[PDB]
Amino acid sequence: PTFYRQELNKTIWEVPERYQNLSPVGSVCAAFDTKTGLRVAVKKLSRPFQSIIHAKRTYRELRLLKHMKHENVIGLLDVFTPARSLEEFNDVYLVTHLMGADLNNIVKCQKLTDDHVQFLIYQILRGLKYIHSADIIHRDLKPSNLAVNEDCELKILDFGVATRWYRAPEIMLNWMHYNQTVDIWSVGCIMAELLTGRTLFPGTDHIDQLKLILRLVGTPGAELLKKISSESARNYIQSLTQMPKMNFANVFIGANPLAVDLLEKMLVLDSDKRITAAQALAHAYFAQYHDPDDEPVADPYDQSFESRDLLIDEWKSLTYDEVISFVPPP
Ligand SMILES: O=c1ncn2nc(Sc3ccc(F)cc3F)ccc2c1-c1c(Cl)cccc1Cl
Ligand SMILES: Fc1ccc(-c2c[nH]nc2-c2ccnc(F)c2)cc1
Ligand SMILES: Fc1ccc(-c2c[nH]nc2-c2ccnc(F)c2)cc1
C-alpha cells in the first residue's frame, strides 16, 4: 500500500491511503476505512521496542488481538507498519471496528433500565467466557475498557475514574495466585454501578479499597482465612473489626431481585466460590438473551512465550513475523 504522513498532537501518524479522516480520540485515532466503508479505531504503539518489557508487551498485545475473534471482544481488522524491512521496523499500528464511546461515557448523567443492564452485562460475560476459555485473565475490567456503540453493543478492550475500584480484593491483598474470577469481581462492580449510578467501592488507596470491600462482603470466614499464606496479611485482616456480609437485598433495594441474586454470586469474597462467566450466562437474569448455541469458546491460545526471557531484537523479529503473517477477518 501507499502511505501518507501527518502530525496529530505531537504524534506522527504514517498509515496507508485506505485510512482517511484521522481524528484523535499508545495513541489512538478514529479514521474512515475506505475499503470497507466503516469507521475504525487505529492505535499507534509508542516506543514498541524501547526495552525488553516494551518489546514483549508489544508482541503480547499483537498476539492477543490476532487471536480474539469474538463479537464482544476487540479483534484486528488490520495490522501494519510503514517499515519496509525488519531493520527499519520501529512502529506497530493496530486497527479495529470503532464503537465510539465507553461505558463510563454512558453511565455518566444517565439512568439505565434493568433491560439495558441485562443486555450490557450479558455481553461482558459472553465476551469473558470466550477470553477465559483461551486461558486469559483480563485483570483490568472497568467501564473505560468497555467500548460501546449506539446500538449498546459492547466490546471488551485492553486485557494484558480509577482501575482500583473495580479490582478484586485478593489483587489488593497482593495474592499472586488469583484466578479468572478476578474478572467476575469487576463485572459485579460494573453491574452494581449501572443499577445504582454510583461506584460500589470508591476507595482512596489499596487499604481503603479493601476496607470498603469488606464492609459490604464482610470480613473473611474461617474457610477463607485458612487459605491466606501470608502472616502479615492475616494479622492485618484479622486485626480489623469483624464485619458481617451485608444483605444484598437491603443494599441494592429496588433492583430486580434476579439482578441482586447474580450480584451476590459474583461478589462472593472467597474467589473459589464466585460464579464463572459460563455459569453466569446461564443465570436466570439473562433468560431473555441467553443461547448456549451462541456463546462460543476460543481456539487454543499459546501463551508459552510469557515464560520466556528474550532479547529486544528477538521480540521485534517475532512481532515482525506476526505483522506479516496477518490475514484479515474476511
Ligand atoms: O470505540 C472504540 N473502539 C475501539 N477503541 N480502541 C481503542 S485502542 C485499540 C485497540 C486495538 C486496536 F486494534 C485498535 C485500537 F484503537 C481505544 C478506544 C476505542 C474506542 C473508543 C473511542 Cl473511539 C472513543 C471513546 C471510547 C472508546 Cl473505548
Ligand atoms: F472506493 C473508494 C475509493 C476511494 C475512497 C476515498 C474517499 N476519500 N478518500 C478516498 C481515498 C483516498 C486515497 N486512497 C484511497 F484508497 C481512498 C473511498 C472509497
Ligand atoms: F481480606 C481478604 C482476604 C482474602 C481475600 C481473598 C479473596 N479471594 N481469595 C482470597 C485469598 C486467597 C488466598 N490467599 C490470599 F492472600 C487471598 C480477599 C480479601
Swiss-Prot record:
PROSITE patterns: MAPK, PROTEIN_KINASE_ATP, PROTEIN_KINASE_DOM. The keyword Nucleotide-binding applies. Disulfide bonds: none annotated. Changing A41V: In a gastric adenocarcinoma sample; somatic mutation. GO terms for molecular function: ATP binding; enzyme binding; MAP kinase activity; MAP kinase kinase activity; mitogen-activated protein kinase p38 binding; NFAT protein binding; protein phosphatase binding; protein serine kinase activity. Signal peptide: none annotated. ATP binds at K43. It catalyses: L-seryl-[protein] + ATP = O-phospho-L-seryl-[protein] + ADP + H(+); L-threonyl-[protein] + ATP = O-phospho-L-threonyl-[protein] + ADP + H(+). It is found in: Cytoplasm; Nucleus. SUPFAM superfamilies: Protein kinase-like (PK-like). The TXY motif contains the threonine and tyrosine residues whose phosphorylation activates the MAP kinases. Belongs to the protein kinase superfamily. CMGC Ser/Thr protein kinase family. MAP kinase subfamily. This is Mitogen-activated protein kinase 14. It comes from Homo sapiens. The gene is MAPK14.
